[PDB]
Amino acid sequence: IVGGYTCGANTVPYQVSLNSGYHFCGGSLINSQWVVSAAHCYKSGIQVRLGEDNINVVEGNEQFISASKSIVHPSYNSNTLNNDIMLIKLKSAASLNSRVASISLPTSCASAGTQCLISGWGNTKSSGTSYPDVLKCLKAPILSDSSCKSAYPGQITSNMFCAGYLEGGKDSCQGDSGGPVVCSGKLQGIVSWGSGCAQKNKPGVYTKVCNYVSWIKQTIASN
Ligand SMILES: [Ca+2]
Q1: Contact status, residue 78 vs residue 18, Cβ threshold 8 Å
Q2: Is 52 annotated as a binding residue?
Q3: How many angstroms separate the alpha carbon of residue 216 from the centre of ligand 1?
Q4: Concatenated DSSP letters for 38-55?
Q5: Binding residue per annotation — 77?
Q6: Which chain residues have CB less than 5 Å from ligand 1, an ion?
Q7: Known catalytic residues?
Q8: According to the annotation, is 194 in a ligand binding site?
Q9: All domains of the chain, ordered by start, with CATH?
């Protein structure tokens, strides 16, 4: 997250870190056994880390649970990033508490202008590289589909939305991928892609979670 703020420990209780020996992507806890992330974060050997603030220090509220299964969306296209969403099942159920909590799925799509909370452990610089140990947060609005398409000609599908600031300076970034965009208490987006980070006229692009609720629910119900 570039241009954001330190969230505070366990203030974003649905935020997960995906770990394969190291943090590599975010995710969102949607019930005691399932995490939603980006398909481009897929790999084997995932350990889900819940209850994290500093990802390099054991602070006392963590739960580390290996994944039993991951399910990339059936129509994910890694070239275009269309349908950039995946589900991860935990080998054992998380113990839910005030610091480790699910986030609700949307019941309708969000609108441009809605303020959302974007979070992660990704790069905090737009030029250069610095990776935080503690969770970072950014409040940002959803942008109109027409501004999004104009920013990224030929690249924005109906399964994507833009959020952020056209002036630059405030955005998600590498290492935030897979993490949450939460608006009014609902998971509306997944950190997906952008041109660089925090660049003028190049807002963040996010997977549009509301399009996937039926697939998520049906997949969980049978897996
Ligand atoms: Ca920790």
Answers
A1: no
A2: yes
A3: 29
A4: -GGG--SS-EEEES-SST
A5: no
A6: 52, 54, 59
A7: 40, 84, 177
A8: no
A9: 1-12+103-210 (2.40.10.10), 13-102+211-222 (2.40.10.10)
